[PDB]
């Protein structure tokens, strides 16, 4: 695919819509995330253009996947990232100097700095972007004012130059938000607040997933297939309120209500709808119709056709040669959902690259007894120490392509990264031979405030020398979201090889969380804190406390000190999220 | 359906496009003929509106088939006639006083009157509308100037008030044009002149039918299914030239070229595409999907769904329960035509009401021997005379719901219309009994210049007292088009009951045309003229010489005088087209 931009170039004619962006680089993000845009043309600040046309971001589509390039000064053009195998971010950390980004201003308070005003926007339910008047701003009245804004689109309605002011976006999509995510989904309930948009959805999960990526949507009501009024079946009503919460909880059958999870975006599927919808036909515009052997292959044909957004495989009785209908609409959704016409429908997987790789589905395997097997806990690594002899030293978790999360105390009297060897995808320690391949560590980042395990801060990152080619054997686990701080995890597991004594086959064990004060009562001498967590009723130093919640695995804890019944104490990973992100980029 | 307009009413929001029309009444025609418009809002001349918004005709669509009505002064709103069972005209005879209708001006010559300037526009290959500067127009230079115009749309690009000028449309769609229609369709031939538009068509007939109703299209090239370049299969290229003719005849296989038949519109199918296209899938936007027993019923489900423009029935092996896909696009055509996916496709018949009823298909029957049978020649009437006794007097042809075309000489010593009785749908004269129903004549319009049969002008209209409910038994025949003057008819027939001696069963006879000078040589004493035609090698006074050409029956002649081999002489109906239309409206 083509990621790089085009200096002084305009794509002639394929317009869908026009928005305002601070830069072409973010124009490209808008295009990538909009359901039809394939190419675009940003207009930079320039003498050769009037100020009203600056910051214009024209989203475009073409049947051929491209358009005519004509020369224009200060026109930056580009392609979307839909066509790409590399992952997709959505997080713009830029503070734009002298840029006044207009929207509906709704709070206007004082702030120490642009950084604090960004933290405020990010932590707010409504904020899309901010403008911060610096201390050098002439009007004393307006000096240090942090005004938060929102628009229909997430995009500013205008962009103008205004010296001594800095604008910037919300970092909710950088996993930096302290906002609580309400995952509670309310059956037989409707909400009646502001209806800002509507889509047709096959079910409420998809309805909620759509709410999450829609910038104006804070919560929703889905009117199900079995809903009485036919005109409203499969209707996903995207809603907002001035409070941020829904005004009232009206009971009603066959309807289903919930919240945006914008703040937990990085740990949830959002753009990745992988299910198939049986005896279901998605109505849209027809891209193509091809012979296909199964619904699964139909989805592939869609995924690999860039303009395709959803499909309906009509199965062949007769012979094995169904018809695969590749479809699209203006909004990524079907215009109508029919049941009872025998179709098998779903969506493009071309989207799942927009999702965090740690949210991809778990491969069904016969997790038998309490002995693990290949692929089962593929985030687990075994940390080897070359010195004295090559031996297992610690457990660790893949959380990145180049990053291991583990315990700081594992590195007591480790004088360089160069004695360390990280093995992935390992069942048996016995499997490890001299010829075996491993990742070498390049850097050990220990928390600068770490002293002792039983004190706080027992957390470490290994930056690997080479990156991991992800596989069923080797995959990352998600960090818990700062918004998920009150989630009650009830499916928690520890894994590792016993570390003293050690075992060969990777062991596994479902174990229960225990509350920080039920833990404190059973341990005195040093204080258990908010930055720790407990469980018990095993594994190694550095190993994961992995909790499964809503089909996704979370790295809730790192094994710190067992002391043993007295429960294991773990580093509370959630409390080190800023830190992990700060250090990893 | 709703035909009547709405005073001071605007339909809020469903905009497709915006054009300029002289009046709301013609706005309604534009809407009816545009492939998506269902409702609209015209803006009349008014103090309460600025002059730039006058004559605005906003074409609108709605998923529900209507929109919100809000009050506005000088906004006229209405619905299309798509929803209607009554026939549809397209012919606006209005001369708009003080109205300057802007377009590309291309000829600018002098003219005696507005009527003559309209006749000139009508007779011209390129003309959509005209403006005529009256003799009272101040600038002496511009006084009496008849300027012809065209636009992309057939619609003027602007409308402005300009005192002492009159504007008006072409009457090509009133069957008033003297322009020759080139029906010759050129196999393995392309044209290379100006490409003004393109559509996907299943075959070249449809391609040509689309050219005919497209105002900018004078001729076309169709690139067939078997065309080498896949990107251009089923491509219907709508073309024009400054000459009006195609520049050159480039040979090339699998391509097929032809002309607009705009001038012969009233005798040809144009909007009525009644065929089914097998192993053919029409791509468009999906309106609905329903269970259906056959392709024929699928077409019905489309026809009766007003937004549906075309369809694809996928047949059930298995059971009798296919899937009928109701579809639509922006232009009435499929966006792509796929072969080989097993679909049966075609178009809405909701269109055929736009076609002249005399173009509807002939019902297959076993036309046996030379004795007719029920339904065979359903335009034929038997003219009875009540006096002395009730007896067959003349043959006649239904050409309207309330009109019979026949011979002037039939009415020798007929003192009132009240002795006349018109019977339709009659095989046997014996079938006629006292209880039998008939149409009473209200008026006998004889050509004022008629003297004697063997002189000219032997033509008469019967205006009936009640109108004919059309049926397989009773249907009209088309007048020949003034543009079809050089058509060589080779499938001509006379029908009637022998009128002297007479027969009971309706007789039929294929007979050959004979040239006017091959006729003149075999008849002297009075002159055969351009306004007569001959045939021979039978029927009554007043009866039809019916010629079948391109699947359509034409009333080429009325039986005037046999004199018998010496051939029959007929009134040459083509030469009395202005007259028939003048008298019938
Ligand atoms: C605007 O936003 C700010 C911060 O999100 C709100 O300020 C807080 O108001 C509450 C209520 O007194 C206090 O407890 C907080 O200490 C305030 N914070 C700060 C930084 O002053 C403020 O109330 C909002 N006001 C409106 C309605 O615009
Ligand atoms: C404009 O249109 C008129 C009529 O359609 C053309 O006038 C005719 O020109 C030919 C060529 O000399 C004459 O034989 C006709 O007698 C003319 N008719 C009249 C009414 O004058 C005229 O040539 C066209 N001219 C252009 C190119 O604008
Ligand atoms: C556009 O710019 C390039 C780079 O200078 C030039 O070579 C080209 O001729 C320009 N215009 C075209 C191809 O129309
Ligand atoms: C490695 O694990 C497999 C799977 O259980 C086991 O059969 C085998 O015994 C182990 N290796 C050794 C040293 O036996
Ligand atoms: C629109 O006009 C009608 C006719 O006077 C009036 O009764 C009506 O109240 C007006 N407006 C509405 C219903 O919004
Ligand atoms: C009427 O026509 C039918 C059809 O040929 C014929 O059988 C019958 O003989 C006719 N009527 C009379 C008077 O026989
Ligand atoms: Cl400001
Ligand atoms: Cl559901
Ligand atoms: Cl398309
Ligand atoms: Cl494709
Ligand atoms: Cl989506
Ligand atoms: Cl003029
Ligand atoms: Cl063909
Ligand atoms: Cl639609
Ligand atoms: Cl419908
Ligand atoms: Cl059409």
Author numbering:
A (entry chain A), B (entry chain A): 2 to 317, 321 to 503, 508 to 545, 554 to 580, 585 to 605
Task: Tell me what the authors wrote about this structure, in their words.
The regulation of extracellular proteolysis is critical to blood hemostasis and innate immunity and proteases plasma prekallikrein (PK), and coagulation factors XII (FXII) and XI (FXI) act as master regulators of several cascades including coagulation, fibrinolysis, complement activation, and inflammation 1, 2, 3, 4. PK and FXI are homologous and share 58% amino acid sequence identity with the unique feature of four tandem repeats of 90 amino acid apple domains at the N‐terminus, which harbor exosites for substrates, cofactors, and receptors 18. Factor XI is a disulfide‐linked dimer whereas PK is a monomer 20, 21. Factor XIIa recognizes and cleaves both PK and FXI but it is unknown which of the apple domains is critical for these interactions or the molecular basis of the reciprocal cleavage of the FXII zymogen by PKa.
The higher‐resolution structure revealed a number of additional features not observed in the previously reported 3 Å resolution FXI structure 19 including definition of the activation loop residues and loops surrounding the active site. A comparison with a 2.6‐Å FXI zymogen structure revealed significant conformational differences in the apple 4 domain defining the molecular basis of the monomeric PKa structure versus the FXI dimer. A major conformational difference is also observed in the apple 3 domain with residues from the loop connecting the apple 3 to the apple 4 domain becoming exposed in PKa as opposed to being buried in the center of the apple domain disc in the zymogen form of FXI. Consistent with this the FXI zymogen structure shows Arg184 is buried and forms a salt bridge with Asp488 from the catalytic domain (LL1), rendering it unavailable for binding to the FIX Gla domain 19, 21. A comparison of PKa with the FXI structure revealed a large conformational 180° rotational rearrangement of the intact apple domain disc relative to the protease domain. A comparison between the FXI and PKa latch loop1 structure reveals the PKa β‐hairpin Glu478‐Lys481 ion pair is conserved as Asp476‐Arg479 in FXI. Latch loop1 has a 180° relative rotation from its position above the apple 3 and 4 domains in FXI where Asp476 interacts with Arg369 from the activation loop closer to the center of the disc inserting into a central pocket of PKa. Latch loop2 maintains a similar extended β‐hairpin structure in both PKa and FXI but whereas in FXI the interaction is with the apple 3 domain in PKa this equivalent β‐hairpin has moved by 40 Å to form interactions with the topside α‐helix of the PKa apple 1 domain. Large relative rotational changes in the position of latch loop1 and 2 are consistent with previous biochemical data that FXI residues Asp488 and Asn566 act as a latch in the FXI zymogen structure covering the substrate factor IX (FIX) binding pocket in the apple 3 domain 24.
